[PDB]
Amino acid sequence: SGFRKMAFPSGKVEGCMVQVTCGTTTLNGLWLDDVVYCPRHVICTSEDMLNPNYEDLLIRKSNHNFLVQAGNVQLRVIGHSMQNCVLKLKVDTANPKTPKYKFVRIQPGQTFSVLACYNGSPSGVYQCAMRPNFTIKGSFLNGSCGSVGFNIDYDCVSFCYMHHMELPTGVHAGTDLEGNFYGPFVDRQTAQAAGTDTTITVNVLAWLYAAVINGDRWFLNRFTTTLNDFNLVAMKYNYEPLTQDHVDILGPLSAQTGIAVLDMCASLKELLQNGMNGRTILGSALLEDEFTPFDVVRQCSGVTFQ
Amino acid sequence: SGFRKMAFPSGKVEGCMVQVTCGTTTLNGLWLDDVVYCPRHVICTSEDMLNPNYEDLLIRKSNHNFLVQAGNVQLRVIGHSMQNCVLKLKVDTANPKTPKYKFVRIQPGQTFSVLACYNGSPSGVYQCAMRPNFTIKGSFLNGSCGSVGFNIDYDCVSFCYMHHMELPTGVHAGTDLEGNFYGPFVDRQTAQAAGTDTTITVNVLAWLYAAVINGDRWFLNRFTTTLNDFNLVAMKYNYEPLTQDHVDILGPLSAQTGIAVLDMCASLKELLQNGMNGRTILGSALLEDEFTPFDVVRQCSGVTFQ
Ligand SMILES: *CC(=O)c1cccc(NP(=O)(Oc2ccccc2)Oc2ccccc2)c1
Ligand SMILES: *CC(=O)c1cccc(NP(=O)(Oc2ccccc2)Oc2ccccc2)c1
Known part of the structure; x- marks a missing residue:
């Protein structure tokens, strides 16, 4: 647990x-x-x-x-x-x-580990996500550029991020390992700003499934939603649209918990409309969107605490 | 940032x-x-x-x-x-x-990294704190016992925790590396439960200083408090008593930000009494207590964003 x-x-x-x-x-x-x-x-x-x-x-x-x-x-x-x-x-x-390694260019909503380094010496490791606006909310000080982000799969390191710069809101911008920026950013001192960001809906849903796997069902309800009506609510709350592909991706967590994806969507709709009323989920008072469905499956038991 | x-x-x-x-x-x-x-x-x-x-x-x-x-x-x-x-x-x-290594038995409120492992193979790394009730809120599945917790200082690994067991609330119990449990727990199948826990006050204060260092002052106020009156409020909210030693320890962060410790205590008192009113601090909607004053100094710039 x-x-x-x-x-x-x-x-x-x-x-x-x-x-x-x-x-x-x-x-x-x-x-x-x-x-x-x-x-x-x-x-x-x-x-x-x-x-x-x-x-x-x-x-x-x-x-x-x-x-x-x-x-x-x-x-x-x-x-x-x-x-x-x-x-x-x-x-x-x-x-x-x-x-063993690979270079990968990731999609927004994907997560990765960052090894923060200074003067070639590693200082710390943390997890973050490529935001929909192609910034990352990292933790970086002067001298950290060239620090990398990565995933590991069966001993193969897939590098996906090299750190370059900090934007005026304190969020971070960088490249894949072939030197192409994520987002519209350029490596010059010109007015550049993060674009408006959105919440990664498929990841919030994955994390609600993690909460259930871990034994917590408080936020569930008896309702369902259509995908269309959910996306109308999502658009209202600055959440990204949920696609049928995302629904497919959440299949295994749905099957492990017995909660249909569109039923979890009805849960999330209620949470957006009503708030949490002082309760927490997995120790957070906000809806967390930096765990992918793969991250949940990797960390959680394969057996639900029913 | x-x-x-x-x-x-x-x-x-x-x-x-x-x-x-x-x-x-x-x-x-x-x-x-x-x-x-x-x-x-x-x-x-x-x-x-x-x-x-x-x-x-x-x-x-x-x-x-x-x-x-x-x-x-x-x-x-x-x-x-x-x-x-x-x-x-x-x-x-x-x-x-x-x-290079040492074995250390840590005090409650201290933090450390955990390398979660299965069948001798590391799977993930995360940060946690020894809670006041001598459990840790880890992430562990069957097969993880013997995974260790550690701090690193100038290339010397100080091991402080070996994982043994999961209690009925889903929190975790284990030993130092000389095999002495933290807390009253024993390695036998008997009714054992975590004792009531408290919030680590000195760490919350450190994290409020991190928020200021990073450029955010919204929660500050013009008030101060005595240490005694603060502790009366703390006791009411299930926070640990703040000692003069803790005040001393927060000295360097106080000096970097120009915010006297007892003035930050008046901030925290207001936050406890009034809540956050929908605002966040360092992206959290709850008061975070798993960063020590040392952790803040290590991660944050030495120059405040004034
Ligand atoms: C450390 C590093 O690799 C790096 C990469 C890109 C940019 C920067 N610093 P920055 O101030 O821009 C430049 C300054 C001088 C020469 C070239 C680029 O980054 C930046 C931040 C916000 C807006 C615009 C530019 C460091
Ligand atoms: C994996 C490991 O090292 C370990 C250490 C201590 C305890 C356990 N499992 P647990 O069920 O207790 C025992 C069972 C059998 C033999 C000895 C100990 O842990 C536990 C959890 C909650 C209450 C009481 C005991 C594994």
Whole structure:
């Protein structure tokens, strides 16, 4: 029993984290095989905020202008190239700790673990979600860029996020590991702001199923809803539309608990319309939307506490 | 910016996790140097619930009745002893991945990371606190006992918790790494229940300071309180008494924000008496008490967003 915001064990990623320095700029990089991946921001100077031209900035650099430090070992850079908003530094040594890995570009509503790092040293691990507006609500201080986000599946690390920047609302923006930003953001000092965000409906429903699996049914009711009428309510509360595909995805949790998906939708509609009246669910007084259906199945028992 | 329930990076502990089997009972163990630590429950049989006599159960075992599996390598047990509610199995191989480590018995209100494991394989990492009633609100399924809790400080892992059992309210009980339970619990199938719990006042205050550091002052007021009058309110709301030592401990956060501790106490008193009125703090609609003052200082910037 119990339900926590749980991250993947971070060891396989810890062994990949390095420090990259170009001139006076230092940040984190990810060392896999003989390549180090890092934000291309590392070639920026103190003046290059407004409109840096990265191609122009990079042609002015040589391999030896890049310093890569892996623990107490300096790695020699033997090639460099830029791919979208990431730099790839070929080093003369393959990381002996490279895990089995993949690079994945995730959809909004998907969750992942973040290993926050400073100067190539991991500091903490936490779970977050790609928001519908393609920001993440992370916890990052200066020096954290190049920290990565990941999922682990049968010992294969799927990297999905590299941290670049903090927007004015305190939320975070970054790229996949091929350097393409999530969302409309660009790596330049221009007015950029998070777009209006929405609540991830399919994840709220998954977490209501987690609450039931764990033994709690207070918020359930005798009603059902059509998918159309639910989505009318959802739209009113700034929730994302629920698709038939989402309903399909919630199938296994529905079957484990015996609660039809559209019946849980009627539960959620009542919760939106009436609030919680001072009660909690899984120890929260708000509806939680940063657990996917897969996350619930992974963490919860396969046997419901009936 | 941002504030998350952050765990320590778990790699140094992952490399220590093994599987221990005695007869038909299997659970997790912790391999440090040439010793494996595990719950003494591993020598229990299917019938030994009510009142097992562990000394009697153990004298009936030999070294070879214990099977220790570390990845795909079997470790040979060459000695065994029991210390309180843990077993120590001397193996013929020192763990080459042993980190610098210590064993610590923590006070209630202290936090730590848990690496949940099954069959010696880590599954997830999360943060929790030793509650005042000496349970933890973990996330554990069958097979998780022997999973450990830990803090990391300058590459030294301080182990503080080994998981044993789940109580009827779904909260969790376990030992320090020398096998002494936290709380009054015993490892036998007898009616045992969590005692009434309280909210960890000094941690709530730390988290209010985190909210201010991150840029949010809505809940502040122009009032102060004496420590005595605050504790009268605290006692009324099932909060723990605040001591002058706690006030001292909150000194650095007070100094970083310019908010005297007793002024933050007046804030908290108002929040208890009036509720939040639909507002949130650091994205929570409840007052959070599983961040220590040390946790806040570690995660937050050293510069307040004024
Ligand atoms: C650390 C890192 O990798 C990084 C990546 C992108 C952007 C930034 N900092 P920022 O202030 O923008 C730049 C400044 C100078 C040179 C290039 C980019 O990020 C930012 C934040 C909010 C709005 C606009 C830009 C660091
Ligand atoms: C897995 C493990 O290490 C462990 C440690 C202590 C207790 C248990 N299970 P439990 O049902 O009690 C025992 C059963 C059989 C033999 C010995 C102990 O735990 C428990 C839970 C709630 C009330 C009382 C006991 C597993």
